[PDB]
Amino acid sequence: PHRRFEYKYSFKGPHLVQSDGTVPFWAHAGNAIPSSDQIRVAPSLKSQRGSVWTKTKAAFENWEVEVTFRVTGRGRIGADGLAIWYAENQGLEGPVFGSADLWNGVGIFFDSFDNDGKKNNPAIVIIGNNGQIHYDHQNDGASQALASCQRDFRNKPYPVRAKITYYQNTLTVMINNGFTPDKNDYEFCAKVENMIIPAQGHFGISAATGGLADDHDVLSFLTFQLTEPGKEPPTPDKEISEKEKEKYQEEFEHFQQELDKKKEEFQKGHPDLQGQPAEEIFESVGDRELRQVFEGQNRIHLEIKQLNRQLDMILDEQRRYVSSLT
Amino acid sequence: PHRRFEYKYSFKGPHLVQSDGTVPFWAHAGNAIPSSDQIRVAPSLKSQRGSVWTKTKAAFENWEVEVTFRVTGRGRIGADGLAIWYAENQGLEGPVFGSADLWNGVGIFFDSFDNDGKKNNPAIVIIGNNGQIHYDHQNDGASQALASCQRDFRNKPYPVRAKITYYQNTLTVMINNGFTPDKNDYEFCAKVENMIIPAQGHFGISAATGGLADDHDVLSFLTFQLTEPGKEPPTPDKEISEKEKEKYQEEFEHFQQELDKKKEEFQKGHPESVGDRELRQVFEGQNRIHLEIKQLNRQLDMILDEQRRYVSS
Amino acid sequence: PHRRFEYKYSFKGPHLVQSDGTVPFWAHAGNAIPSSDQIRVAPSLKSQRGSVWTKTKAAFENWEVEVTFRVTGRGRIGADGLAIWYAENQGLEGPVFGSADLWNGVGIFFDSFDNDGKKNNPAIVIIGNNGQIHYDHQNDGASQALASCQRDFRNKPYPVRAKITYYQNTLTVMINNGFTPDKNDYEFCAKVENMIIPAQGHFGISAATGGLADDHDVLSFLTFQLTEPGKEPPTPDKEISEKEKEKYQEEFEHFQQELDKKKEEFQKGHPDLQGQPAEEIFESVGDRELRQVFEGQNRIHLEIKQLNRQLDMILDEQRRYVSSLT
Amino acid sequence: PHRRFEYKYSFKGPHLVQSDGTVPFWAHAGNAIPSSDQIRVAPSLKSQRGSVWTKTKAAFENWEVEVTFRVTGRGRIGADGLAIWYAENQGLEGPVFGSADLWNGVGIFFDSFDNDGKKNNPAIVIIGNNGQIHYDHQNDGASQALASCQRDFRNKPYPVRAKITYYQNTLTVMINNGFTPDKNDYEFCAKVENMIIPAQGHFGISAATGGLADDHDVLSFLTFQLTEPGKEPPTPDKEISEKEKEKYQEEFEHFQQELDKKKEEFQKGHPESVGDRELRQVFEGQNRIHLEIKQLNRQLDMILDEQRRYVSS
Amino acid sequence: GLDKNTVHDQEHIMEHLEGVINKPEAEMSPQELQLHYFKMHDYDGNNLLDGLELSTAITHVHKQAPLMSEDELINIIDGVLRDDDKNNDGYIDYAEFAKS
Amino acid sequence: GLDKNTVHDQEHIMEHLEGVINKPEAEMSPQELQLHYFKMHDYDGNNLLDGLELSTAITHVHKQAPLMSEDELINIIDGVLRDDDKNNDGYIDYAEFAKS
Amino acid sequence: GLDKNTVHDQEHIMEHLEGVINKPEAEMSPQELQLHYFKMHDYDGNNLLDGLELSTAITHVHKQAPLMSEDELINIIDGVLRDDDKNNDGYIDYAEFAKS
Amino acid sequence: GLDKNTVHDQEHIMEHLEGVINKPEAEMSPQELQLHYFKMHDYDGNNLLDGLELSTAITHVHKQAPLMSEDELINIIDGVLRDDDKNNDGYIDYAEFAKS
Ligand SMILES: [Ca+2]
Ligand SMILES: [Ca+2]
Ligand SMILES: [Ca+2]
Ligand SMILES: [Ca+2]
Ligand SMILES: [Ca+2]
Ligand SMILES: [Ca+2]
Ligand SMILES: [Ca+2]
Ligand SMILES: [Ca+2]
Ligand SMILES: [Ca+2]
Ligand SMILES: [Ca+2]
Ligand SMILES: [Ca+2]
Ligand SMILES: [Ca+2]
Ligand SMILES: [Ca+2]
Ligand SMILES: [Ca+2]
Ligand SMILES: [Ca+2]
Ligand SMILES: [Ca+2]
Ligand SMILES: [Zn+2]
Ligand SMILES: [Zn+2]
Ligand SMILES: [Zn+2]
Ligand SMILES: [Zn+2]
């Protein structure tokens, strides 16, 4: 289908927040911390709840939503987790992943904690609700689940990219798990066929944290209206001539390569310019634990060196005392 | 020395923040996030500054502060770092570890980023100031370092503990590196003799984050007034009778065990993991090896000095 | 639907093998080791390949297959893995999970190694082949996959139970991951709709092992013919009377409880009867590594005790020598 | 003692089994599974017995065997166990660790299951036999144990190594527990003095599994004939000229480095993980601590005995 | 082939009950020992005798005669299932067993 | 402000006891309930009460009420410390607490 | 609202190119600096100007005046997109930018 | 059996060199190829050849041939050890190998 980007229902860096300190076209509430690069919906503190919702309602019969997010934790178990919503009303605060219950719409829940005890978490659960059903958070929504895929999204070297597509009453969620830096590496997670959602509603993200604490960050939210090939606009007749289209782009590319050649010799011209790698950023929990043990052994090593030196001194002085007396 | 705990210049859990949303007796500013269990002075976001400062000034000739904190980050490299201040005025915001420059007092800087490039970070730097010198951010304060240190306080299994003591015009910084959950496991890190500080100032804590981001959480900050054993005036008959204390304490120690016995059956009447316990056992074994080797060092010192007495004869 | 157990296409313990040393109605080949409790299709040795296939072909329009299996490994990464087949011809030996390629049928591959490098293994992949397509083992069959669910089946406290149902040209795979001892705890893994398989074929299991080595064991294979409620046999008119059915079962239950009461007081009558728990059997790889480190510290502890005792002796003897001279 | 390696009574990788499917010079029987890298003498299945025995008998007055093996099981409790035999005849099948009872010779039993219930397993038990006594399975051979030991050879990061030496009618069993990849890291486990064994017998290895199941894999089995330094007859001029040896060895040591330099660029011309390297570093650090403490013990012994010489004067 | 005297045999039932139950009975009613015969070969515990359990009931290892061939075993099991099982479940309940 | 009735409130000690102690209490001696008051307001586990703990004791919301100004709580805590703590450690022992 | 003098302004282009490129140019052709203007605000790197990048192009933080309200910003961005974007993609290519 | 031509086979040393060494060889000195023969048949890395390694050297299948009886290989290896090994260590040094 044909894709149209919608700016009023999207947000991204590196200028995510205005000078006021609020995301354009989005209202944030709870413990959300909007920054210039991402939104920390729930910080790694006990009992945090945050949400960011669109101000204006979106009337799209078919849509695509691309959410880039990172969920980080110190331990192996994680907090309550994240949730992407397309509802009728702004949930804001509440008990369901930092948002209100009894929502009329669709919710894709990235649940990191195993309340049910089934040992199948973290997971991605597609749940559609009509405003009368209550989400059973102690059961991880197992009875109410319309779709469930068990894909670990916590503690990844690269941000996790979820793509949620509503098209022909079919909702498909495809996830790039963040093992590779390539953005276009999406893999199928789940689908729901023949689901009815409200005709117009608000997009939203929410996050919550229980006894264990995770950092839930959303780097970018991207919204695309989808149009069928049969239902396309009649013509892009507005375009004047293809000749100017074949006259402008080579000048644009010539400018790009000239700018690159202008950049190259002066990147090395100023010695203060440097570069920092990102290899140190990623470390697994068990790897960090083993490194901590290796660091802990250094005290023992230094104390053994101290003991050896003291033994050397006592041996030498006993030697010289024995020589002196004899 | 005799220690008197001062509640006005201290904060700790498990109820650290009131229902209003502010730390009692402390003013937070910047990107600090006070919570029930700790204060996240600077979160792991780009360009974050935070500070928590006492409201009322402290008039102590000798003092001691014990600070428990965690500096946790995804990367091996660290953020700008953490700072503990005894100043004249509340710095609040500023460019020196999230607090104001040109302070009149002393600042203990836990610096986790190597701006100078000398490969000597993270480190603990004690810097005194009188208000007429700028802190050198790019040189990590090496030029004005009264004392220095080299300890890694980042990403430790247990929270890092620091005891900073001003006694007889001497400042001593002792650090438990966070490899053991023992509170009184401090090891000597730095000291400065004959340092003058303002006789009445504010106690503050601050944190800052640069391009790389760490979370600087402060779990507790306990301030003690120190007095000399001879300078403390003893008041006769001020204390209660000793026999009454004995009777009270014996009934209290009986009743606490009675309460424990009451709770033991009911906890299972109405209803740590593997690997975590294994890691805890590994760290306990490392601590046991460390303590045994220190005991061997003490025994070596004892036999050495007894041999010195014998050699003298 | 109505279920009928088929013994000729099934095998289970605790009498899995006859006195000859072969599974009844099944032919084994390769490095398979049929035992009295399970079949070790591929032992934990380098370059092992094993297969067990039914002798007679099964002509079922709808069927259910329940495979109980255990895949165990010392490390975190595993061998090539296991495969369940419903083919036209017996694959026996070959390069595809210990069985031949170019199979005409359906294969559910429990793949434990990540040949593609996508970091999405272990996984369960449903692949249908018609005899002309070649399984791309270096690509984990990603291009040829008809279904893929990422469920970790390696190193589980209880055996993993997969249920594969072909019904109305729909193939559903539901997996109990082995976290709980309850057999009837199946969770949905994958489905394929409108797939055409050969009308009659052989059931089979195969397993293979690459550079890394895993133990692949099959405890039980159970086959059920499925009949639609519309397509049921006309009547179970053969049954004579319900009165005898209501006369026999209470006598049977009375015998069962009498046998239990006969057993109870004589279980404790003989003191040699004991009981062994199964808690020791399960341990994770990282848990075993940490326990190995803890065991390794004991040498250091004992050597420190030896040093302390020697220091005590030297201190005491220097003390007595000093006292004697003075 | 001078050691001569005997290939006929040995087996090792990386080509352990021929294309026929049998170990050279060795006959396997029972549930043993010879492979290219090791022999799985008993797999982790219920009621498995396996044995590998030499074909030709050995006539050595003094001998030494080095066996590398792994006993790996899912559970903390172990199977029946492993056995190393110097016997008169090939036991093959039987009830004593998968080999025949009533053996005439010596058996070193690595027993990992506590049949007796004395909580002293796993253990290494040396049992001599003349053919007229049954091995007591239920008592773990405690009654007829010439020597004993207590080491855990199950589920170790590195393969467990054992050196069994018959010299001057004395049998010594030394064990590297598998905490280090060093081959010559043996520690004393047991010894028996003045034990008589048959002057010509077979070398065998065996394993058995009871209700609980372990995999007993033997990676290598190297047998050396031992001769005394004085008993060895020296042949004059049998060795080559020393200068010719020097020229040969210097050209060989040049050419091996030349080959390494040749391979280094081409390996990357046409093209261990994190955590595994961390675990290896942890084990290396533990070994370093162990070696340093042993060095401290040796220094303590040196100062102690020098003080004894001084006290004598 | 599931003969009446085979299930009604006392010695076979006594050998199977040896060890598991510590009360040896000199005599037993044919119905009682047929309940024991149904209970002993139900290894899974579902109180139903399927083809695989009858395979170990017919062929046996008792401590001889060569083990029965695959075709004859298939014929005997198929005959027993076709005669005694009327619910088409593939199993034999105790009512089905006691009926024939 | 360390009032006798506030320490002797049966319902308040019952509210603190709810959850942690499954067994409820109906009648209680004054020493019993004052020891519950001392133990429930001792979170650190050092068996001593300091100003930071008495601040929580006086100004915890329960289940409304205006939050006390810091000056008033400073005065109350200072009065308690001066009246009861003869130790001058900054910590209130149960001897010092039980005097009042 | 994407005025011709706004993109054609030399000082704005010079401030944005300050630091990133180390060659300051005293004069530049309007087409050259309009290519620079298109390149500077394409933060993502896809060579397309969407609404979110024009939001940071119109509203700004330069080191004043209060930040432009949400409704006016929405109207300006919607007008620019409706006038210059004809392919209904939601983005503006350099051909679309140079046309208007 | 440690024949001069078998050690001097250019194609056999090339076959052993394939894979491990990316660069192929066309002409080779006798010392060069005999050192390749010594190194490729030294798997343990001890720079010494023993009977277990010479057994693989003589009786490895490559790409047929009847597998040699154990007695013949015993005779060949014993002859090599007696002729070349003056060391009596049970190991063949490259001095001992280069004598023949
Ligand atoms: Ca959950
Ligand atoms: Ca769950
Ligand atoms: Ca710095
Ligand atoms: Ca520095
Ligand atoms: Ca694979
Ligand atoms: Ca894969
Ligand atoms: Ca035993
Ligand atoms: Ca024992
Ligand atoms: Ca049954
Ligand atoms: Ca039936
Ligand atoms: Ca307290
Ligand atoms: Ca006190
Ligand atoms: Ca763009
Ligand atoms: Ca466009
Ligand atoms: Ca060698
Ligand atoms: Ca030699
Ligand atoms: Zn029988
Ligand atoms: Zn209360
Ligand atoms: Zn600008
Ligand atoms: Zn070759």
Author numbering:
A (entry chain A), C (entry chain E): 42 to 367
B (entry chain B), D (entry chain F): 42 to 312, 324 to 365
E (entry chain G), F (entry chain D), G (entry chain C), H (entry chain H): 40 to 102, 108 to 144
Can you provide the manuscript's text about this entry?
ERGIC-53 transports certain subsets of newly synthesized secretory proteins and membrane proteins from the endoplasmic reticulum to the Golgi apparatus. MCFD2 is a small protein composed of an EF-hand domain with two Ca2+ binding sites, and functions as a binding partner of ERGIC-53 in a Ca2+-dependent manner. From the amino acid sequence, ERGIC-53 is predicted to be a single-pass transmembrane protein that consists of a luminal carbohydrate recognition domain (CRD), a long stalk domain, a transmembrane (TM) helix and a short cytoplasmic tail (CT). Here we present cryo-EM structures of full-length ERGIC-53 in complex with its functional partner MCFD2. These structures reveal that ERGIC-53 exists as a homotetramer, not a homohexamer as previously suggested, and comprises a four-leaf clover-like head and a long stalk composed of three sets of four-helix coiled-coil followed by a transmembrane domain.
Consequently, we determined the cryo-EM structures of the head region of full-length ERGIC-53 complexed with MCFD2 in two forms (forms A and B) at 2.53 and 2.59 Å resolutions, respectively. The present cryo-EM analysis reveals that the overall structure of the assembled head is composed of four ERGIC-53 protomers and four MCFD2 molecules, confirming that ERGIC-53 exists as the tetramer. The tetrameric structure is stabilized by a central coiled-coil composed of the long S-H2 from each protomer (residues 326–367). Although ERGIC-53 forms the homotetramer, the four CRDs are not related by a fourfold axis, but arranged in a C2 symmetry. Two CRDs are located in the upper layer, whereas the other two lie in the lower layer. The upper-CRD protomer vertically associates with the lower CRD protomer to form a dimer, and then the two dimers are further assembled to form the four-leaf clover-like tetramer. In the assembled head region, two different CRD-CRD interfaces are formed: a vertical interface (interface-V) between the vertically assembled CRDs (between protomers A and B and between protomers C and D) and the other interface (interface-H) between the horizontally assembled upper CRDs (between protomers A and C). Two different forms (A and B) of the head region are determined, in which the positions and orientations of the CRDs relative to the S-H2 are different. The superimposition on the central S-H2 coiled-coil demonstrates that during the conversion from form A to form B, the upper and lower CRDs rotate by 4.8˚ as a rigid body. Consequently, interface-H in form B is formed by interactions between different residues, such as van der Waals contact between Gln191 and Glu228’, while interface-V is almost maintained. These results suggest that interface-V involves tight binding, whereas interface-H is variable.
